Ligand binder design. Structure first.
Ligand SMILES: Cc1c(-c2ccc(O)cc2)n(Cc2ccc(OCCN3CCCCCC3)cc2)c2ccc(O)cc12
Ligand SMILES: Cc1c(-c2ccc(O)cc2)n(Cc2ccc(OCCN3CCCCCC3)cc2)c2ccc(O)cc12
Lengths: 232, 215
């Protein structure tokens, strides 16, 4: 993981991409969709270099922290070519007014759409997207490990080393595309700052999802998926 | 005023730094302190290169969106040397057990402590800190062009500072990334803090208060 090159990081990340799922009232469809995506999210996470090096506990923690962000950046990505609409699924393309049908949703909708617009304006590349998504996975929960064990310190150091490698990969992509050094740093910063907005959206989204909340605790579901046996 | 050098930007940012305020029931004192810090925050913002070029509408918007983040990073910054504690003020140094005293605070408390621990492990520098804080101001409401131009300028300035500390180009973009990802955590803390504080908000807009402070 730490010995991979930039080209090999990109390659692994592209390979790891989950499928685009299809929708099979509107909130039910959306909720079913998210539920199905989660499973594929875990498989993806397990294929992000370094992730399986972590403890199962930490793996759960990172996903528990990042799952909505991860859903969102994927949505924003899929939607980038559909101005004013969100492509939840290839057969579930929703607009703003469709969002009003659900109490509390348009505000999130409008935020998602603006982020999609912002990606469009930057001409975000696929190679860039997967690096960002991976960053989200490894970063979002890293400051909330409520533990100061030696093992935990080791985990966090590993996480930041992998994060460093992904940064190296982003710059590499940008240099390859002919960007000057100054333009590289600037673009790196612009993209990373978008993650702050995605976090923000995620917290607003969690509130919203809670206003409409019975359920198994997410942790145990994540472990079940994550904690697989080795029997194949 | 994109025309400043990196050195000049850093200088302007360091000089713009607000004072450390004092306290004279915990929540009353905290609220009173934050309320007083806000005015100084407004005057700090006015001295951030590029900020006054914005419309007042936009100045107000940035401030309304960024104020708690700004209070937090300052708090974390002055709490670095107080392991296990948060220095809200020189005379208001509180531990997590003191935070547990207010329903819903200890979670945010622990997060602020983790952030201070991260800053400590990163050996965050003053010059870095003032750029970060400037980035928070200009980035927290943007979701435009002049704002991005100034943001780009602050990115250049951070890089400049890291180059001048002797870091390889690889180390530079690695550290730049590390610092900007911390801002995700700060936004997160702000979101959670805002949830906490409202658990209820005024009818009168904060925008009006901010507008009046700029006078
Ligand atoms: C961003 C986004 C949303 C969404 C989320 C929050 C909102 O307030 C509005 C829309 N939705 C709708 C939605 C998202 C998440 C939902 O979570 C319900 C909770 N549970 C099921 C989801 C998996 C893990 C947590 C348990 C329910 C509905 C998406 C569906 C698929 C997708 O790829 C992206 C999204
Ligand atoms: C980080 C931080 C907090 C805080 C708030 C909530 C938490 O759960 C944890 C810490 N507090 C406590 C606190 C922060 C903000 C508060 O805002 C409520 C009133 N606001 C009036 C309208 C907006 C401008 C600021 C005041 C009330 C209390 C701080 C005080 C000073 C300071 O420099 C930093 C902080």
């Amino acid at each position: 993981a730490l010995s991979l090159t930039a080209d090999q990081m990109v390659s692994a990340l592209l390979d790891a991409e989950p499928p685009i799922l299809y929708s099979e009232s509107m909130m039910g469809l959306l909720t079913n969709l998210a539920d199905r995506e989660l499973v594929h999210m875990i498989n993806w996470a397990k294929r992000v270099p370094g992730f399986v090096d972590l403890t199962l506990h930490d793996q759960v923690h990172l996903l528990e922290s990042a799952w909505l962000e991860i859903l969102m950046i994927g949505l924003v990505w899929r939607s980038m070519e559909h101005p004013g609409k969100l492509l939840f699924a290839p057969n579930l393309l929703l607009d703003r007014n469709q969002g009003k049908s659900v109490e509390g949703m348009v505000e999130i909708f409008d935020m998602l759409l603006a982020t999609s617009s912002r990606f469009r304006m930057m001409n975000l590349q696929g190679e860039e997207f997967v690096c960002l998504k991976s960053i989200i996975l490894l970063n979002s929960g890293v400051y909330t490990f409520l533990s100061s064990t030696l093992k935990s310190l080791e985990e966090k150091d590993h996480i930041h080393r992998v994060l460093d490698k992904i940064t190296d990969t982003l710059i590499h992509l940008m240099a390859k595309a002919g960007l000057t050094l100054q333009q590289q740093h600037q673009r790196l910063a612009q993209l990373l700052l978008i993650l702050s907005h995605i976090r923000h959206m995620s917290n607003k989204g969690m509130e919203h999802l809670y206003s409409m909340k019975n359920v198994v605790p997410l942790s145990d579901l994540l472990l079940e998926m994550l904690d697989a046996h080795r029997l194949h």
